[PDB]
Amino acid sequence: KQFHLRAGKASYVMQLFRSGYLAHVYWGKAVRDVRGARAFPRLDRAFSPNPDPSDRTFSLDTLLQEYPAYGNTDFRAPAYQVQLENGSTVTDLRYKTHRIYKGKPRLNGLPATYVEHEQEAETLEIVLGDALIGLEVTLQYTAYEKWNVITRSARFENKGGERLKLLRALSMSVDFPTADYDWIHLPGAWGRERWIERRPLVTGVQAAESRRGASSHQQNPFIALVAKNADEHQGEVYGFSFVYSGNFLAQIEVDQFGTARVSMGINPFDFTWLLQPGESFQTPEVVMVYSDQGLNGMSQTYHELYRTRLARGAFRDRERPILINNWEATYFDFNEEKIVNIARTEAELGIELVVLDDGWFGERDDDRRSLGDWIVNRRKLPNGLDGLAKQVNELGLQFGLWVEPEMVSPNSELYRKHPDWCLHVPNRPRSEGRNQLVLDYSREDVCDYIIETISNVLASAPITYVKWDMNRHMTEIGSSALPPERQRETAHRYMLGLYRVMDEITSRLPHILFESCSGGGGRFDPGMLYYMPQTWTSDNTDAVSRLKIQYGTSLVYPISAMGAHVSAVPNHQVGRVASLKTRGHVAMSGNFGYELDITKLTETEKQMMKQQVAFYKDVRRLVQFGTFYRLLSPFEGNEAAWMFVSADRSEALVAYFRVLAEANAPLSYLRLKGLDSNQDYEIEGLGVYGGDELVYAGVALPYRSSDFISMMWRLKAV
Amino acid sequence: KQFHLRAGKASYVMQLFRSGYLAHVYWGKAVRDVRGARAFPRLDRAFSPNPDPSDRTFSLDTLLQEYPAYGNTDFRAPAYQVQLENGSTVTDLRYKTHRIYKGKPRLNGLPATYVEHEQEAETLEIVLGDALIGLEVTLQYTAYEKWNVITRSARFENKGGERLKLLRALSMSVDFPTADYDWIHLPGAWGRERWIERRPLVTGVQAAESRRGASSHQQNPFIALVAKNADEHQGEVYGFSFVYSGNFLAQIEVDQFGTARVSMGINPFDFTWLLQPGESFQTPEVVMVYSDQGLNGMSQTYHELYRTRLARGAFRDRERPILINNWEATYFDFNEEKIVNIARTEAELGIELVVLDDGWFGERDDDRRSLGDWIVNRRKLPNGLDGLAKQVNELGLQFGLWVEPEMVSPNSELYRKHPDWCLHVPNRPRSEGRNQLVLDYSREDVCDYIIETISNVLASAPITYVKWDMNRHMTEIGSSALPPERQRETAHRYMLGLYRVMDEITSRLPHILFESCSGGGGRFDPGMLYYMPQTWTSDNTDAVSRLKIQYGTSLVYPISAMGAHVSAVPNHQVGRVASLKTRGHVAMSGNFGYELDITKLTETEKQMMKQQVAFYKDVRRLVQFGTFYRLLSPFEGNEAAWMFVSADRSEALVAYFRVLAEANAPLSYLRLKGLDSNQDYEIEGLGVYGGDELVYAGVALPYRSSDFISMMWRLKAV
Amino acid sequence: RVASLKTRGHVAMSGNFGYELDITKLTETEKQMMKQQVAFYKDVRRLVQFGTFYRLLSPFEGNEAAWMFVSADRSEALVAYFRVLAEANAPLSYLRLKGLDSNQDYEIEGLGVYGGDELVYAGVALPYRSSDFISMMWRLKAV
Amino acid sequence: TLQYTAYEKWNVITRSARFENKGGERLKLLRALSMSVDFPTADYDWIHLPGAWGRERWIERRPLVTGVQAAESRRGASSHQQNPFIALVAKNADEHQGEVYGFSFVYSGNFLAQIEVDQFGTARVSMGINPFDFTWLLQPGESFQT
Numbered sequence A, B: 001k002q003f004h005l006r007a008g009k010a011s012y013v014m015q016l017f018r019s020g021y022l023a024h025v026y027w028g029k030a031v032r033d034v035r036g037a038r039a040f041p042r043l044d045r046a047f048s049p050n051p052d053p054s055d056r057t058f059s060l061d062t063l064l065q066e067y068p069a070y071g072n073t074d075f076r077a078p079a080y081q082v083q084l085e086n087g088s089t090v091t092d093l094r095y096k097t098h099r100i101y102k103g104k105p106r107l108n109g110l111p112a113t114y115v116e117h118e119q120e121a122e123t124l125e126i127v128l129g130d131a132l133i134g135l136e137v138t139l140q141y142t143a144y145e146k147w148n149v150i151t152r153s154a155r156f157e158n159k160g161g162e163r164l165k166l167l168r169a170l171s172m173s174v175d176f177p178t179a180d181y182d183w184i185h186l187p188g189a190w191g192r193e194r195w196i197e198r199r200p201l202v203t204g205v206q207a208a209e210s211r212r213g214a215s216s217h218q219q220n221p222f223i224a225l226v227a228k229n230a231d232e233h234q235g236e237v238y239g240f241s242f243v244y245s246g247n248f249l250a251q252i253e254v255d256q257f258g259t260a261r262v263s264m265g266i267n268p269f270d271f272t273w274l275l276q277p278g279e280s281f282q283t284p285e286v287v288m289v290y291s292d293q294g295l296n297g298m299s300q301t302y303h304e305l306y307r308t309r310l311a312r313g314a315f316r317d318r319e320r321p322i323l324i325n326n327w328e329a330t331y332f333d334f335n336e337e338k339i340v341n342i343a344r345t346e347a348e349l350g351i352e353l354v355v356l357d358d359g360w361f362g363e364r365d366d367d368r369r370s371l372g373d374w375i376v377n378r379r380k381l382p383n384g385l386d387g388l389a390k391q392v393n394e395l396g397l398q399f400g401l402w403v404e405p406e407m408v409s410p411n412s413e414l415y416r417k418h419p420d421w422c423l424h425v426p427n428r429p430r431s432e433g434r435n436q437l438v439l440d441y442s443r444e445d446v447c448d449y450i451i452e453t454i455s456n457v458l459a460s461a462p463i464t465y466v467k468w469d470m471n472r473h474m475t476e477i478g479s480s481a482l483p484p485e486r487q488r489e490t491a492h493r494y495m496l497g498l499y500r501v502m503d504e505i506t507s508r509l510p511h512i513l514f515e516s517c518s519g520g521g522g523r524f525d526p527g528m529l530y531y532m533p534q535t536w537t538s539d540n541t542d543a544v545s546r547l548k549i550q551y552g553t554s555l556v557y558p559i560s561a562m563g564a565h566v567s568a569v570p571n572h573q574v575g576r577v578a579s580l581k582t583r584g585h586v587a588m589s590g591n592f593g594y595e596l597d598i599t600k601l602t603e604t605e606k607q608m609m610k611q612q613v614a615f616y617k618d619v620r621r622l623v624q625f626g627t628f629y630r631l632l633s634p635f636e637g638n639e640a641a642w643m644f645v646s647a648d649r650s651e652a653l654v655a656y657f658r659v660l661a662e663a664n665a666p667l668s669y670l671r672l673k674g675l676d677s678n679q680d681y682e683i684e685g686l687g688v689y690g691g692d693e694l695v696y697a698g699v700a701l702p703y704r705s706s707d708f709i710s711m712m713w714r715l716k717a718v
Numbered sequence C: 001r002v003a004s005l006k007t008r009g010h011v012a013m014s015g016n017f018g019y020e021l022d023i024t025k026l027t028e029t030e031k032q033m034m035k036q037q038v039a040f041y042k043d044v045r046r047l048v049q050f051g052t053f054y055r056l057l058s059p060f061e062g063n064e065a066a067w068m069f070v071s072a073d074r075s076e077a078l079v080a081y082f083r084v085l086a087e088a089n090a091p092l093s094y095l096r097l098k099g100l101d102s103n104q105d106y107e108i109e110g111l112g113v114y115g116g117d118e119l120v121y122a123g124v125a126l127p128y129r130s131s132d133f134i135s136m137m138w139r140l141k142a143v
Numbered sequence D: 001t002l003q004y005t006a007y008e009k010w011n012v013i014t015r016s017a018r019f020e021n022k023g024g025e026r027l028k029l030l031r032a033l034s035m036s037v038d039f040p041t042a043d044y045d046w047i048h049l050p051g052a053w054g055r056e057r058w059i060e061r062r063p064l065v066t067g068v069q070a071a072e073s074r075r076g077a078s079s080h081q082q083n084p085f086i087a088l089v090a091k092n093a094d095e096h097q098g099e100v101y102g103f104s105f106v107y108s109g110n111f112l113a114q115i116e117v118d119q120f121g122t123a124r125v126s127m128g129i130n131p132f133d134f135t136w137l138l139q140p141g142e143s144f145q146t
């Protein structure tokens, strides 16, 4: 009774142990069979109790599982936990049946990686069951054909006569036989999202999580087990990516016997879910990627998968527009005149899209009011949104709009009319973040209002771009429309409502490129990527700061989704003075755009913009859709370097960065990756080099002084 | 507005911040005043919401707290969490009043460190309260005068008119300003408890815990923050020790701003506690220790505190008897004839105590029955317990007895008469560990039965020693005598019952030396130490294996409570063959005893035991009550070394161990600690050396081959 | 140090094998094993002395030591494993092999048939064993 | 005459030097190593085989220092103390992957296996007869083969 999933060049093996227990066997490089799946020492482990008292060698505490529970002889953290009406939390899932079908199913009300054809993947559903309480849990396994991708999710269903309160419902849980690994997660904060942190495993519990009702800047919903000697180019890597934009738990547990339990899903903390007889619960999926070619190998798998089989819309395989954003340029202080006046210059520079940011609606001359009142400010925009987009479109420029539909200002017409439409709890002070409150997306009336309001605003003007922002984390989580026994479902219901809101709006407006945002990369997760094919990576627009941020973001998320804008100096977040050349090279290593006041730019800088915009247009397809290789990590020293390679390896773009200048420095060298060794490459403005030479020998770098420098070379085969 | 606790040579500083928020300030080497407690930058941290909408510089997500909560502008792991009847988990504790009184209070139904005089310590009780729900929480702080010890615990009380469910109630929580620390905890298993694990802190969550209803072999209730360069002899160390013997959580959380939140208490997982209007809840205490003298400085503080102000009874300050246990010798196969037969030789060897282990009651020929039926098996002991004890005393030996009152075998008269007295949940298979079930000590009838039955047994014979054992971990945790809304209180109510049971039994029998046990050091925690002054360290009685175990154990617990027996070879746990000299030297480094078959020994071996016993008696006071220094760690190399120093530093005992011998080895050297540098010492059997010479230069060790060697020297001042 | 004759044999078979001890002081049991040791090494002498050598576990990095000898055509293999200090209640041990044809299944003498790709990518569970200074040696033959 | 030999089936480069005095005066070789090579970078670890009698050739992995590191023998024999072999390995190189550069001396007497890292991050690896306590005299017409 053995299940075998073949995903790309990888294998995921499961087994039915004894009387209907689902046991984990193997995950790694693909094998034909695991003959020694049951050929392991059956040991009597002291203080590991037995479901069958007669056999001391069997214990759920010492069994590698796929969906473990606590209570019946397992003392490790469970994948799920259900509390009965009698108060007990003991459950017992046994194998009932299974089914295998080509393709990949949709998740109910949740984002998920998909397929366009049946042959692209195969799905294994393992139906477990607890007969005493009628609890049915279906484990959804999907294996992609071309990629090393295994996705996992669980669907609960109450087929009993009693009420079941889910205390914990993680998306997956896998027990590794050994624990001699490091682990990489992506901690951070606002202005510095997703720093790569590598740590050795401890004997106990390690976890990255979010209690902020969002994926957050503090911890990105992604963890990975790496081999001790694994680097960017080689070694075994196991990735764990959560397709969900709310609260999450990403945990690794090492027990007494050197096994490592990796579990991931909706954070159990402050979370419950009542299941009446007949009701069901669907968990979001976790994308699990294996690679024996280091972090680059893993990331590239994620890059292709998320860009072609997660992101949607007409702009999925489309080159993204080079836009100009007015946020850092003017903030709230702007008008229709100043925007139209500068639009002439922008079109001459090669800019393709003008994006009107926060401050167009209500009385938004600051960030303390007007949220929820999505009506055009006539004092600032006399001709309205349609009039502005009109004057912009005739100059060959596209128009874009900024919205934060999940938020409501206390000082707004919406909050005066609907004070109960926000997240709150009875008789408690309503705490504010950036002087605003969170709308109750758990409610059907609130969601329907937003869906109708926003859809009309975006259709009231020839708009082809929308920036969806959110600048607050949930506090006083609760809903008036929910009974006391369902109050802890509020956070997830909010995220479900949000997913419902975005799905309907984006459907009504297919001609609109949506870009998710949240004080920068506060929601840079696979969930948001499903609804909006790109994200504002970080509010930190500093060239040097972006080195770490974009490097870490690229570990999981594709470049096509990684928004990067050239800003002004001294930087508004750090005060650093870097050359326009290096700012461009950094931003051209992502989804390229601008965000600065052109009126304050010198004629030399204005000229460099024209050159930059023209340059990125020649490499836009290469940067956004090509294979991405990281070379030098800014987390490991004074340098940063990466490169983009085409599918046929005929073209390539290389970027190099050095932050702090060294007097009388040693000669610098750079070794490349992903090029065809059996072919020569011309490095534009540097000469012809061998493909084998650039990878095995490397290339001498120009000697340069000055802080914060950058180099870009276009590589073409001969 | 600043609370200042002065514990020994250390300071613990707190302050009231704004509208009655209790904030942490400083903990480390003693200072007169922290004048810069408020002189820190007030920043607007993005996505960190504000209790005061006008002031973005204030947030509970950025405040160093003493007992933080989740829900109102704090996104880090809370010290507690309460669910109201309306379903909300938002609470808001503010300052009310505080009291300061000499001495130290007892904790209701809980073990705690104590004082014999008011002058020995002061106690600060800060009263916090949530006006809306009528919740009063009293934070209990106690600072000792001579030791660097701050103890913390909390007391809840529902003064409102509604029910309150404590989802989480940790004993303490503290926010360090920085997070540049390593952390040490004590993971392990049966036969290898408390291995010292040093790990760097991760940005996120690291934790050591227990979900087994016992402090467990797997994770000892102790974590510590140490400086990056702190070792055994120098550097800042922050110890956290849980005075509790059940489920626990010991967590460290590093946030986005590099602050470290250390929290410890009853494990929130699978735990709730309902508080009816008028009801209360007292948490166990956490003993917090600071030292700048490294790990030795921390341990020695714990040693004096736990030995003299936690352990109780008439044997607290008394030298512990050199006993002999028969468990490894005969196991279950013994009789009255065999015991008094060998007891003649045991008396002549100098042994002071004969301990009768498992197998004396009911029909214990196996570990499959009789647990619960605590009557003497007349088949094995025809003259009963009274008869066997008298034949022992007449040979000049004390008599001891083994019990496991917390358990019940399905095959027993107790279970057939009371099958609902065990821990169980409705309609679920009753899992067995070592073919036994756990008794429901949450019930008054069960406890009352045990208190009466055990007291009568131990009074039916001249017994002066008791080995209290437990060989299973709780599964299917539930009580038939509890309402469904209190089922998750079972695990803690069990521990309360056990404490009550142990407290009354040891009170009826003040003349009996009680030693706790749990398949070894399964519950070697401060909680158990309060009721029983010593503990069986590990079932692993291998001299080399005991090096790591006893080394790790001494980090927190005093040598006086660290049981160590000399066993036979090849060892029963690892099959290792070490010399009797070595096994003696390892065991004499703790509470010395024997546990092997004497009849199977040779003539030259019995003469060594006679010398070992005599030698230990001469240094028993020094070993059990002297100052302990770790010199060489078996976790860091092939060697292990430590020493005992008298209070006036005039007498010392040095132990050295070398596991694997290397051919043509470099010369070995050993530097000592805690000696008077201004005084010479005579190493017995080596010569006269200077105190400064032994500490600063060291002593050249004699070269010798073979594996598993040991050296022991007595040091006397001239 | 006192180590068993079996492990002493297994270590010496991992090189140019020979003997250097007083045979007259050996017990009957020890001389029997010695005869089997000589016969066994003769079967794998060409493999050990002229085959491809792979190191698996380093005794400079941990409590273990492991290596294997692979023939030129990768149809034969001799795997040796060593564990020095025994730990009580030890975690399960595993050993991943190297230098085998992943497309072929291999027969481990005594145990059974394992996949070449399995032996390299997944590894094989080792028997739990007590006592210090233990050794295990398996002959591998392509199916 | 610098002698270089490259094998076909193996990644083996062998090196040796041959001195010859074709002048009128006599020359004194104070040092005559078999080879020397300057690596452009020096971000490597190095492995040598130190030991003693009864424990020869233990593996020792160490990071490179900016300066001089060397294994050598002054015992008139290759010795148990230091085996005539050193290697430059990549920082992430192990038993199964990574770039390694082995240097093996085909000589049984005194040796010097030295790695020097200069002010500009270059690594000079040289190996040959130990210069210490060693000289060689070349009269006009005489030769010395390393």
Ligand SMILES: OC[C@H]1NC[C@H](O)[C@@H](O)[C@H]1O
Residues within 6 Å of the ligand: A327, A357, A358, A402, A469, A471, A517, A518, A519, A520, A536, A538, A539
């Ligand atoms: O308030 C507007 C501001 N919010 C945060 C976003 O990330 C910025 O780009 C900008 O849109």
Ligand SMILES: OC[C@H]1NC[C@H](O)[C@@H](O)[C@H]1O
Residues within 6 Å of the ligand: B327, B357, B358, B402, B469, B471, B517, B518, B519, B520, B536, B538, B539
């Ligand atoms: O079964 C008895 C056994 N239980 C476990 C203890 O640790 C042993 O010493 C012995 O008392």
